[PDB]
Design an enzyme around this catalytic site. Structure first.
Site, PDB file in Angstrom:
ATOM      1  N   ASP A 149      87.641  26.604   2.432  1.00 38.86           N
ATOM      2  CA  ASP A 149      87.346  27.824   1.695  1.00 38.86           C
ATOM      3  C   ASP A 149      88.482  28.842   1.744  1.00 38.86           C
ATOM      4  O   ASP A 149      88.738  29.515   0.747  1.00 38.86           O
ATOM      5  CB  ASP A 149      86.037  28.462   2.183  1.00 38.86           C
ATOM      6  CG  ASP A 149      84.800  27.864   1.497  1.00 38.86           C
ATOM      7  OD1 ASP A 149      83.725  28.516   1.548  1.00 38.86           O
ATOM      8  OD2 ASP A 149      84.892  26.768   0.889  1.00 38.86           O
ATOM      9  N   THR A 150      89.183  28.956   2.872  1.00 38.67           N
ATOM     10  CA  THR A 150      90.403  29.801   2.879  1.00 38.67           C
ATOM     11  C   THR A 150      91.405  29.361   1.804  1.00 38.67           C
ATOM     12  O   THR A 150      91.886  30.168   1.006  1.00 38.67           O
ATOM     13  CB  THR A 150      91.106  29.814   4.259  1.00 38.67           C
ATOM     14  OG1 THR A 150      91.296  28.480   4.706  1.00 38.67           O
ATOM     15  CG2 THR A 150      90.243  30.564   5.281  1.00 38.67           C
ATOM     16  N   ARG A 180      79.102  28.332   1.849  1.00 39.83           N
ATOM     17  CA  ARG A 180      78.570  29.112   0.742  1.00 39.83           C
ATOM     18  C   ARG A 180      77.031  29.103   0.873  1.00 39.83           C
ATOM     19  O   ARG A 180      76.354  28.430   0.096  1.00 39.83           O
ATOM     20  CB  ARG A 180      79.036  28.533  -0.610  1.00 39.83           C
ATOM     21  CG  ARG A 180      78.896  29.512  -1.802  1.00 39.83           C
ATOM     22  CD  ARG A 180      78.625  28.801  -3.152  1.00 39.83           C
ATOM     23  NE  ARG A 180      79.834  28.219  -3.728  1.00 39.83           N
ATOM     24  CZ  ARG A 180      80.186  26.933  -3.658  1.00 39.83           C
ATOM     25  NH1 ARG A 180      79.417  26.041  -3.040  1.00 39.83           N
ATOM     26  NH2 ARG A 180      81.327  26.539  -4.214  1.00 39.83           N
ATOM     27  N   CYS A 235      96.059  31.331  13.358  1.00 36.00           N
ATOM     28  CA  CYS A 235      95.708  30.113  12.611  1.00 36.00           C
ATOM     29  C   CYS A 235      96.655  28.981  12.944  1.00 36.00           C
ATOM     30  O   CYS A 235      97.857  29.118  12.755  1.00 36.00           O
ATOM     31  CB  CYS A 235      95.712  30.369  11.084  1.00 36.00           C
ATOM     32  SG  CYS A 235      95.499  28.876  10.115  1.00 36.00           S
ATOM     33  N   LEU A 236      96.115  27.877  13.454  1.00 38.30           N
ATOM     34  CA  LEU A 236      96.905  26.684  13.679  1.00 38.30           C
ATOM     35  C   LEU A 236      97.302  25.983  12.386  1.00 38.30           C
ATOM     36  O   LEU A 236      98.294  25.219  12.351  1.00 38.30           O
ATOM     37  CB  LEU A 236      96.147  25.690  14.570  1.00 38.30           C
ATOM     38  CG  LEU A 236      96.115  25.951  16.084  1.00 38.30           C
ATOM     39  CD1 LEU A 236      95.265  24.873  16.735  1.00 38.30           C
ATOM     40  CD2 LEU A 236      97.552  25.968  16.667  1.00 38.30           C
ATOM     41  N   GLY A 237      96.519  26.198  11.331  1.00 37.13           N
ATOM     42  CA  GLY A 237      96.815  25.558  10.033  1.00 37.13           C
ATOM     43  C   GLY A 237      97.780  26.324   9.135  1.00 37.13           C
ATOM     44  O   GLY A 237      98.044  25.880   8.035  1.00 37.13           O
TER      45      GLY A 237
HETATM   46  C1  HEM Z   1      95.118  30.559   3.404  1.00 37.30           C
HETATM   47  C2  HEM Z   1      94.690  29.646   4.302  1.00 37.30           C
HETATM   48  C3  HEM Z   1      94.179  30.007   5.712  1.00 37.30           C
HETATM   49  C4  HEM Z   1      93.835  31.213   6.193  1.00 37.30           C
HETATM   50  C5  HEM Z   1      93.913  32.572   5.478  1.00 37.30           C
HETATM   51  C6  HEM Z   1      93.400  31.040   7.573  1.00 37.30           C
HETATM   52  C7  HEM Z   1      92.952  32.050   8.416  1.00 37.30           C
HETATM   53  C8  HEM Z   1      92.654  31.898   9.756  1.00 37.30           C
HETATM   54  C9  HEM Z   1      92.299  32.958  10.668  1.00 37.30           C
HETATM   55  C10 HEM Z   1      92.153  34.445  10.300  1.00 37.30           C
HETATM   56  C11 HEM Z   1      92.107  32.431  11.878  1.00 37.30           C
HETATM   57  C12 HEM Z   1      91.738  33.267  13.135  1.00 37.30           C
HETATM   58  C13 HEM Z   1      90.238  33.329  13.324  1.00 37.30           C
HETATM   59  C14 HEM Z   1      89.914  34.125  14.559  1.00 37.30           C
HETATM   60  O1  HEM Z   1      90.829  34.684  15.231  1.00 37.30           O
HETATM   61  O2  HEM Z   1      88.698  34.194  14.865  1.00 37.30           O
HETATM   62  C15 HEM Z   1      92.332  31.000  11.770  1.00 37.30           C
HETATM   63  C16 HEM Z   1      92.283  30.066  12.776  1.00 37.30           C
HETATM   64  C17 HEM Z   1      92.327  28.701  12.636  1.00 37.30           C
HETATM   65  N1  HEM Z   1      92.625  27.976  11.479  1.00 37.30           N
HETATM   66 FE1  HEM Z   1      93.113  28.822   9.695  1.00 37.30          FE
HETATM   67  N2  HEM Z   1      93.484  29.702   7.876  1.00 37.30           N
HETATM   68  C18 HEM Z   1      93.949  29.027   6.769  1.00 37.30           C
HETATM   69  C19 HEM Z   1      94.172  27.670   6.669  1.00 37.30           C
HETATM   70  C20 HEM Z   1      93.927  26.704   7.633  1.00 37.30           C
HETATM   71  C21 HEM Z   1      94.099  25.269   7.482  1.00 37.30           C
HETATM   72  C22 HEM Z   1      94.685  24.556   6.230  1.00 37.30           C
HETATM   73  C23 HEM Z   1      93.697  24.688   8.617  1.00 37.30           C
HETATM   74  C24 HEM Z   1      93.736  23.179   8.908  1.00 37.30           C
HETATM   75  C25 HEM Z   1      92.636  22.571   9.352  1.00 37.30           C
HETATM   76  C26 HEM Z   1      93.247  25.734   9.509  1.00 37.30           C
HETATM   77  C27 HEM Z   1      92.783  25.591  10.795  1.00 37.30           C
HETATM   78  C28 HEM Z   1      92.556  26.606  11.701  1.00 37.30           C
HETATM   79  C29 HEM Z   1      92.225  26.378  13.082  1.00 37.30           C
HETATM   80  C30 HEM Z   1      92.049  25.011  13.782  1.00 37.30           C
HETATM   81  C31 HEM Z   1      92.073  27.754  13.711  1.00 37.30           C
HETATM   82  C32 HEM Z   1      91.673  28.029  15.182  1.00 37.30           C
HETATM   83  C33 HEM Z   1      92.810  28.428  16.103  1.00 37.30           C
HETATM   84  C34 HEM Z   1      92.245  28.753  17.468  1.00 37.30           C
HETATM   85  O3  HEM Z   1      91.064  29.186  17.563  1.00 37.30           O
HETATM   86  O4  HEM Z   1      92.993  28.583  18.470  1.00 37.30           O
HETATM   87  N3  HEM Z   1      93.418  26.952   8.881  1.00 37.30           N
HETATM   88  N4  HEM Z   1      92.676  30.710  10.457  1.00 37.30           N
HETATM   89  C1  LIG Z   2      70.625  39.143   9.429  1.00 37.03           C
HETATM   90  N1  LIG Z   2      70.436  38.717   8.049  1.00 37.03           N
HETATM   91  C2  LIG Z   2      69.088  38.744   7.491  1.00 37.03           C
HETATM   92  C3  LIG Z   2      71.526  38.304   7.246  1.00 37.03           C
HETATM   93  C4  LIG Z   2      72.172  39.274   6.464  1.00 37.03           C
HETATM   94  C5  LIG Z   2      73.248  38.934   5.637  1.00 37.03           C
HETATM   95  C6  LIG Z   2      73.696  37.615   5.580  1.00 37.03           C
HETATM   96  C7  LIG Z   2      73.075  36.623   6.346  1.00 37.03           C
HETATM   97  C8  LIG Z   2      73.542  35.291   6.294  1.00 37.03           C
HETATM   98  S1  LIG Z   2      74.780  34.784   5.359  1.00 37.03           S
HETATM   99  O1  LIG Z   2      74.171  33.957   4.351  1.00 37.03           O
HETATM  100  O2  LIG Z   2      75.507  35.832   4.689  1.00 37.03           O
HETATM  101  N2  LIG Z   2      75.764  33.891   6.272  1.00 37.03           N
HETATM  102  C9  LIG Z   2      76.904  34.447   6.965  1.00 37.03           C
HETATM  103  C10 LIG Z   2      77.558  33.377   7.829  1.00 37.03           C
HETATM  104  C11 LIG Z   2      78.561  32.504   7.076  1.00 37.03           C
HETATM  105  C12 LIG Z   2      79.007  31.412   8.037  1.00 37.03           C
HETATM  106  C13 LIG Z   2      80.239  30.646   7.584  1.00 37.03           C
HETATM  107  C14 LIG Z   2      81.013  30.183   8.816  1.00 37.03           C
HETATM  108  C15 LIG Z   2      81.705  28.845   8.595  1.00 37.03           C
HETATM  109  C16 LIG Z   2      83.156  29.055   8.160  1.00 37.03           C
HETATM  110  N3  LIG Z   2      83.764  28.741   9.410  1.00 37.03           N
HETATM  111  C17 LIG Z   2      84.817  28.941  10.182  1.00 37.03           C
HETATM  112  O3  LIG Z   2      84.648  28.359  11.231  1.00 37.03           O
HETATM  113  C18 LIG Z   2      86.097  29.765   9.936  1.00 37.03           C
HETATM  114  C19 LIG Z   2      86.636  30.114  11.335  1.00 37.03           C
HETATM  115  C20 LIG Z   2      87.901  30.987  11.244  1.00 37.03           C
HETATM  116  C21 LIG Z   2      87.578  32.275  10.461  1.00 37.03           C
HETATM  117  C22 LIG Z   2      87.065  31.906   9.063  1.00 37.03           C
HETATM  118  C23 LIG Z   2      88.163  31.091   8.349  1.00 37.03           C
HETATM  119  C24 LIG Z   2      88.493  29.797   9.107  1.00 37.03           C
HETATM  120  C25 LIG Z   2      88.988  30.178  10.517  1.00 37.03           C
HETATM  121  C26 LIG Z   2      87.201  28.954   9.197  1.00 37.03           C
HETATM  122  C27 LIG Z   2      85.785  31.075   9.202  1.00 37.03           C
HETATM  123  C28 LIG Z   2      72.885  34.320   7.076  1.00 37.03           C
HETATM  124  C29 LIG Z   2      71.805  34.650   7.900  1.00 37.03           C
HETATM  125  C30 LIG Z   2      71.353  35.969   7.954  1.00 37.03           C
HETATM  126  C31 LIG Z   2      71.979  36.966   7.187  1.00 37.03           C
END
Ligand code: HEM
Ligand SMILES: CN(C)c1cccc2c(S(=O)(=O)NCCCCCCCCNC(=O)[C@]34C[C@H]5C[C@H](C[C@H](C5)C3)C4)cccc12
Ligand SMILES: [K+]
Length: 404
Positions: free
Chosen positions: A241-242, A176, A347-349
């Site tokens: 956050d998901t 956030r 998603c592995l989770g």
């Molecule tokens: C409503 C809940 C969740 C949603 C909607 C969600 C969504 C996603 C999505 C969209 C991706 C694919 C990202 C991409 O292709 O770039 C992802 C990957 C992944 N998620 Fe989740 N997720 C959820 C919960 C969880 C939880 C509980 C875990 C446990 C730690 C988790 C762990 C992971 C991991 C490790 C990957 C990476 C898989 C890889 O890159 O091979 N997720 N998830």
């Molecule tokens: C160019 N300019 C000026 C800009 C303009 C507007 C906004 C800007 C912001 S910003 O403030 O809007 N920031 C955007 C980036 C948010 C990062 C969050 C990633 C971490 C969650 N991680 C995951 O790994 C996951 C990875 C995967 C997908 C998803 C769910 C799971 C699984 C967890 C995310 C920052 C800096 C510049 C900005």
């Protein structure tokens, strides 16, 4: 607005802003669904946020997620500078390298692990709900949703309870962002917490997820402290956050639809199917890919290095995937969506997430069947890589509840 690159034809320009969509006040999913109105091409360019493509229909979203050779996870976030600094494993890697890191991660969050945690998840949900039940009100997002998945993570990772507030502060700083620190600074702060714990557990491994990860084998050899750190960071944040935001969307809908509440009250066996339908309707993730090379994709010239947002949210909202997509029906026969992604990074989770959701809905409806949005409250949505609910004030009459 970033200047339109010369290769992008004018007729494909739709300046959607994924961090502040117009019409957000009407609900995030709704605000994104404008990308699916009949005069919006399947694949568009927006000039917001640096400029990037957006695939707007499920067919293209699925296809791009399958084709890792053209659509690389090396830089998966908009804006570009965040995707660039992001180095989590496996989300920042492409197959074939990603394949075995994914196998290791799967040992730690996959199905057999979930089936064993089922009851611990249940005991947690129950104690959170019981502590709220007599008050007749909560902020669901803050009082139930936020404490929930962080606590399940601590259980998985064998981390101590006292660490929760600190870890929560570190992860919120990353996910956030208020603009006070770059993504890269937030990541380093988080890494500074993880680094020593990995060191410790490589020297003295236990049976927690961090020990399994930090001591695993990948592509022939032992995982590096750097790679383990990079995996553990994703294991931590990926489920926070998901789950928080998804549970919030779900509870908001149930608070607003007594008929759906009643359905699940009278028919609890439908909760797993209702979970799937909610996953589709209140889908919330939107990440993407970078073009590895010039590529013509469904009639559109894409240029090496162009970013493409492939919103996981949109596939299941697409009329072409599910009829009357904004309508919630727990008995929908073919619920299609990509809420958990698609292709090699699926998603592995997902299995743990579904138990978190199902357990939450089951335990809550059982203890607090009748609840509402607080009188006079207007629910605020937020939009991003993970879209969400700013706050969810709920009220109920405690006499209509029961301790269980
Ligand atoms: C409503 C809940 C969740 C949603 C909607 C969600 C969504 C996603 C999505 C969209 C991706 C694919 C990202 C991409 O292709 O770039 C992802 C990957 C992944 N998620 Fe989740 N997720 C959820 C919960 C969880 C939880 C509980 C875990 C446990 C730690 C988790 C762990 C992971 C991991 C490790 C990957 C990476 C898989 C890889 O890159 O091979 N997720 N998830
Ligand atoms: C160019 N300019 C000026 C800009 C303009 C507007 C906004 C800007 C912001 S910003 O403030 O809007 N920031 C955007 C980036 C948010 C990062 C969050 C990633 C971490 C969650 N991680 C995951 O790994 C996951 C990875 C995967 C997908 C998803 C769910 C799971 C699984 C967890 C995310 C920052 C800096 C510049 C900005
Ligand atoms: K990167």
């Amino acid at each position: 607005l970033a200047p339109l690159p010369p290769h992008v034809p004018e007729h494909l320009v739709f300046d959607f802003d994924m961090y502040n969509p117009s019409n957000l006040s009407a609900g995030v999913q709704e605000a994104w669904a404008v990308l699916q109105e009949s005069n919006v091409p399947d694949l568009v360019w927006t000039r917001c946020n640096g400029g990037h493509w957006i695939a707007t229909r499920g067919q293209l979203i699925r296809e791009a997620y399958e084709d890792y050779r053209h659509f690389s996870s090396e830089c998966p976030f908009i804006p570009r500078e965040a995707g660039e600094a992001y180095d989590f494993i496996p989300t920042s890697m492409d197959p074939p390298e990603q394949r075995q890191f994914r196998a290791l991660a799967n040992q730690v969050v996959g199905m057999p692990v979930v089936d064993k945690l089922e009851n611990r998840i249940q005991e947690l949900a129950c104690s959170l709900i019981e502590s709220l039940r007599p008050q007749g009100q909560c902020n669901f997002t803050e009082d139930y949703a936020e404490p929930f998945p962080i606590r399940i993570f601590m259980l998985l990772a064998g981390l101590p309870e006292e660490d929760i507030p600190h870890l929560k502060y570190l992860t919120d700083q990353m996910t956030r962002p208020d603009g006070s620190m770059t993504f890269a600074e937030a990541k380093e702060a988080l890494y500074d917490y993880l680094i020593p714990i990995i060191e410790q557990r490589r020297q003295k491994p236990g049976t927690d997820a961090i020990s399994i990860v930090a001591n695993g084998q990948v592509n022939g050899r032992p995982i590096t402290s750097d790679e383990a750190k990079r995996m553990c960071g994703l294991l931590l944040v990926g489920g926070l956050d998901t789950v928080v935001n998804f549970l919030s969307f779900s509870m908001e809908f149930l608070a607003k639809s007594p008929e759906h509440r009643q359905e699940l009250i009278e028919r609890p066996e439908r909760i797993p199917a209702a979970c799937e339908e909610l996953l589709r309707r209140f889908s919330l993730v939107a990440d993407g890919r970078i073009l590895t090379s010039d590529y013509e994709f469904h009639g559109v010239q894409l240029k090496k290095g162009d970013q493409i947002l492939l919103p996981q949210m949109l596939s299941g909202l697409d009329e072409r995937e599910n009829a009357a997509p904004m309508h919630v029906d727990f008995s929908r026969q073919k619920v299609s969506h990509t809420t958990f992604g698609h292709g090699s990074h699926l998603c592995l989770g997902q299995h743990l997430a579904r138990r978190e959701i199902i357990v939450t809905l089951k335990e809550w409806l059982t203890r607090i069947p009748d609840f509402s949005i607080a009188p006079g409250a207007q629910i605020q949505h937020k939009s991003g890589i993970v879209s969400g609910v700013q706050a969810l004030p709920l009220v109920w009459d405690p006499a209509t509840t029961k301790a269980v």
